[PDB]
Design a protein around this ligand. Structure first.
Ligand code: OC9
Ligand code: OC9
Ligand code: OC9
Ligand code: OC9
Lengths: 198, 198
């Protein structure tokens, strides 16, 4: 469908050039459609970006729910390591999508806040699953639930920052590093498990 | 001295308004000196910012070296927790300086890179002290020196990001939270110690 081709082109072009410098015309020629056809489907550039962004994050969210159904009984450290492994695999296999998602930090303030608010409406869910899994554990002395959860969420939140800093626009480098990043994530989560639990 | 008054005014105004929106004229009236007197001492706004920034980081660096002379025999987790405690104390007592330092992320690219390079010329030192202290320890199974060091440096590097996100421009809130942040840093470093070592 033409709408899907436009969305796919938008992911590619926004991810290569950034929000500000990408144009709807570039997206339209990349999708192989007429320049006005963007505006048939999408009110403007902002809504094009937003719909692309929501399209990608929805697909990801469905994958996370499938994974969650299948790994819910693992302890949280194992669960999180496995999910991070999946995101690392997704990023190496869909570099343009990953490059697309990280352009959010340089989107216009109004659109960016709008999207950051939408994303919180799944992050506060995961956050709560983490909190619940934490109650299943016998926590080490002085390790409160609030500290365990802060620290784990800060660890998890650092995925995007590493990506932006090191792998954005470098698909070959991430492919080269993928298995080693997985190996390091496992050790770091084992460090946190051993330190947080009795 | 007039130069010191200008530098102090620059810290205050750059920290309140940001690099881009601050003017030398604002700085000059804040310092109580003539508008041209800035340019007697400082070639331009960029050099004014740079000299202010180097003035603050130098003072901090001297404090870090004093601390290092006095705490070098502590293990690294204790050493780092104590240094973080000092920076938290410095930030609560010098909010305007802390607000000043965090404006670096929104400085013009050329000046920002220049300063980020200068700061690396002390961060690579601390980094190496951390590496050396790590060799004194018996590391836990699979915890390599490179992983221990990556993880600890990422932990330590998160100070500035929390500040920017939560305490920039909110001196009362940081004062309110200071002792609790210290208490949480201690537990987090104890988590890392227990997990990283045998
Ligand atoms: C900067 C090296 C350590 C970053 C670990 C990233 C956490 C994975 O979510
Ligand atoms: C694509 C980058 C995210 C993975 C972060 C894991 C870093 C551990 O060294
Ligand atoms: C976002 C809550 C955890 C941040 C811990 C910050 C590390 C202190 O350098
Ligand atoms: C001024 C903010 C830096 C302190 C970060 C410690 C966060 C632990 O909750």
């Amino acid at each position: 469908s033409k709408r899907d081709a436009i969305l796919k082109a938008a992911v590619e072009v926004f991810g290569k050039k950034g929000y500000d410098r990408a144009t709807t015309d570039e997206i339209a020629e990349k999708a192989g459609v007429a320049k006005g056809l963007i505006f048939h489907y999408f009110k403007n550039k902002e809504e094009l970006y937003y719909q692309a962004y929501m399209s990608v994050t929805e697909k990801l969210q469905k994958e996370f729910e499938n994974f969650l159904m299948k790994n819910r009984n693992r302890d949280i450290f194992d669960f999180m390591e496995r999910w991070i492994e999946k995101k690392l695999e997704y990023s190496a296999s869909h570099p343009e999508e990953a490059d697309f998602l990280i352009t959010l930090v340089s989107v216009d303030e109004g659109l960016r806040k709008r999207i950051l608010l939408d994303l919180e409406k799944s992050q506060r869910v995961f956050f709560d699953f983490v909190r619940e899994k934490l109650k299943d554990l016998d926590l080490a002395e002085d390790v409160t639930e609030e500290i365990a959860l802060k620290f784990l969420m800060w660890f998890f939140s650092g995925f995007e920052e590493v990506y932006l800093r090191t792998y954005q626009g470098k698909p070959e480098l991430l492919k080269r590093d993928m298995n080693t990043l997985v190996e390091e994530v496992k050790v770091m989560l084992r460090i946190l498990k051993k330190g947080m639990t009795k």
